[PDB]
Each structure stands twice: as C-alpha cells, then as structure tokens.
Design a protein around this ligand. Structure first.
Ligand SMILES: Cc1cc2nc3c(=O)[nH]c(=O)nc-3n(C[C@H](O)[C@H](O)[C@H](O)COP(=O)(O)OP(=O)(O)OC[C@H]3O[C@@H](n4cnc5c(N)ncnc54)[C@H](O)[C@@H]3O)c2cc1C
Length: 296
C-alpha cells in the first residue's frame, strides 16, 4: 500500500556490466565565479531508453580503470530533471553535479574521479549510465499533499524534478493543488541553484508554492547566527511542526549527510516542548512515508 508513486517504476533496466551509452547534449556551469566550488547542470540523451520517475537516481561509470585495471565503480546522482525532461520529450536526463577537489595527506591536490569526468564532458561525448535506481524519494500520490523539501547544495536535484512536474508541465492524470514548500541552503548567493526557475514557479503558483533560501555565509538570524537550513526553518517552527502533525504532509530531505543532525536538533526541542519524543515520532513518520531522506 504505497502513498508514493511506486506503481510501474523501472529499476535497474541498465547495469554496470551492461550500461546504457548516452551522449552529452549540454553541460553548463551553474554557479557564479565567487562560489566555493563549481556545480554543473548537464543533460544527456537517452532516447527514451531510461524510463525514470521523479525522485530517482542513475549511476554513472566514469571512463578509465581503477588502479587494478578494472573499470571504475559507479557513482550515484539523483536525477535533476522531471520524467519528461528539460525538453519535455522524455528522451533526455539531467544531472546536478558538484566538481570534487581536495588535498590529500601529503598536501597534494586531488580531483574526484567521477565529478571531474562529468564536469568536463563536452557535448557529443558518450557516457555510460546505469539505473534508474531508487524508491525512497518518490513523490506522493496525493495531488493535494503538503510537500516540504529541504535541500542543501546538489541536494536540490530531486526537488527540481518534482517541481518541474508540478508547475511546469500539464499531465493528463496529475494536477498538483497542495502546498509545496522549498527550503534551499547554500553557502553563497553565487551557489543558489536554479533560483530563476524557482522564481518563475512562484509567480505562477503563488498560493501553492513557498520558497525560502538560506545563504549561510551571508545571512544571519537576530542572535547573529549563521543562516543554515535549520536556522532558517527555526523561524517557522510553529508552522512546520504544526504541518508535521497532519497526515497529508510529506517531508523530503536531500543533500549533505551533515544536514540531518542540525534538523533533528531543532526537532527534538520542538517536540519535547509538547511532550513528544522526537525519536519515536520520527520513526512513526518514517513508517508513514512522511519523513523521506537521502543525504550523502
Ligand atoms: C545517493 C547519492 C546521490 C548523490 N547525488 C549526487 C548529486 O546529485 N550530485 C553530486 O554532485 N553528487 C551526488 N552524489 C555524490 C556522488 O555520487 C559522488 O560521490 C561525488 O560526485 C564524488 O565522486 P568522485 O568520483 O568525483 O570522487 P572520488 O574520486 O570517488 O573521491 C571520493 C572520496 O573523496 C574523499 N574526500 C572528499 N572530500 C575530501 C576532503 N576534503 N578531504 C579528504 N578526502 C576527501 C573521500 O574519501 C571519498 O570517499 C550522490 C551520492 C549518493 C550516494
């Protein structure tokens, strides 16, 4: 009995031993020069062979071999495009990828294998994909659901997917009429992903969509605290907590593993105030398909 759009999903049509080979159509930097680190939005052609649904992931196998002459292991990317895709024909797939660069123990700079291969792709290059993967982040079946989305960085991906479906497409069997609420936590104004798309949706469905940004390094609360995602939510605690109390409210969280803790910290307090144990409540929410998380 799912509350999510699980019926007829496709999973692992394509596997690492037998990946689908698509081609890169577009690759754009989506962050400003200021921004700490780059995020790219890239679109691949799949000719309709990968029948994915909003909320799913695909695996990518970066070209080359590991230190043992074996092919690289796949990396997971949550799909950033809705099922029809950015061109609305259901034959392309889009990714939101942050370029990973670090320094090892010896002070040597290291590039992440898969993120660099991807961010480097040129239109026309081929790419090996697997999947689609996932059920965890599927959308609720209920077109009148209250949908709360908390993403950090690249974690915006699945929410972009949902939103496109909700507000930029006409579907024969789906018409969103609830309230969607997005909170996006980024470090800088130059790291605000797809804001322009979101501003157009806001205009379009002003009573159905709520939008809040948290730019850590540029925003503070009254206390003078950094504007983290929880820091921004805290400002709506009464509301959100009230929202959590209703059966038709679904929470989705995506992004950096770190985010989980600070939200649980806020939650723990709100609930206790009311005589509720957050740890148990959450578990029930999870069981009810109301508290959905994918962080990494
Ligand atoms: C379910 C899921 C969804 C994801 N969705 C996306 C997405 O939508 N967008 C996206 O960009 N990523 C996403 N990721 C992350 C992505 O899968 C890759 O792991 C990421 O792009 C880096 O892989 P790479 O091959 O570039 O790095 P690799 O070459 O594999 O380097 C990985 C290793 O880097 C090391 N490392 C990282 N930072 C440091 C540091 N500061 N110091 C020392 N060591 C360090 C760690 O040991 C780590 O295991 C997702 C991951 C998962 C599991």
């Amino acid at each position: 009995h799912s509350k999510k759009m699980e019926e007829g999903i496709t999973v692992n049509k394509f596997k690492p031993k037998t990946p689908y080979v698509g081609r890169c159509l577009l690759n754009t930097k989506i962050t400003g020069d200021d921004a700490p680190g780059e995020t790219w939005h890239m679109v691949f052609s799949h000719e309709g062979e990968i029948p994915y649904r909003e909320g799913q992931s695909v695996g990518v196998i970066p070209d080359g071999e590991d230190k043992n002459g074996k092919p690289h292991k796949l990396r997971l990317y949550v799909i950033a495009s809705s099922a029809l895709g950015d061109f609305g024909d259901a034959k392309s797939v889009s990714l939101c990828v942050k370029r990973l660069i670090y320094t090892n123990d010896a002070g040597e700079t290291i590039k992440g294998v898969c993120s660099n291969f991807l961010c480097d792709l040129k239109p026309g290059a081929e790419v090996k994909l697997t999947g689609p993967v996932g059920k965890e982040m599927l959308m609720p079946k209920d077109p009148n659901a209250t949908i709360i989305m908390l993403g950090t960085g690249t974690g915006i991906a699945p929410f972009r997917s949902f939103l496109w479906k909700m507000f930029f497409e006409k579907h024969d069997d789906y018409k969103f009429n609830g309230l969607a609420w997005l909170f996006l936590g980024v470090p800088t104004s130059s790291s605000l992903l797809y804001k322009e798309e979101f501003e157009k949706m806001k205009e379009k469905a002003p009573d159905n969509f709520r939008l809040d940004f948290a730019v850590s390094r540029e925003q503070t609360n009254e206390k003078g605290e950094k504007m983290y995602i929880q820091t921004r939510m805290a400002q709506y605690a009464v509301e959100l907590w009230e929202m959590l109390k209703k059966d038709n409210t679904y929470f989705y969280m995506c992004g950096l593993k770190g985010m989980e803790k600070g939200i649980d910290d806020i939650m723990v307090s709100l609930a206790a105030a009311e005589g509720i144990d957050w740890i148990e409540y959450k578990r029930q929410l999870k069981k009810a398909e109301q508290w959905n998380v994918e962080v990494y």
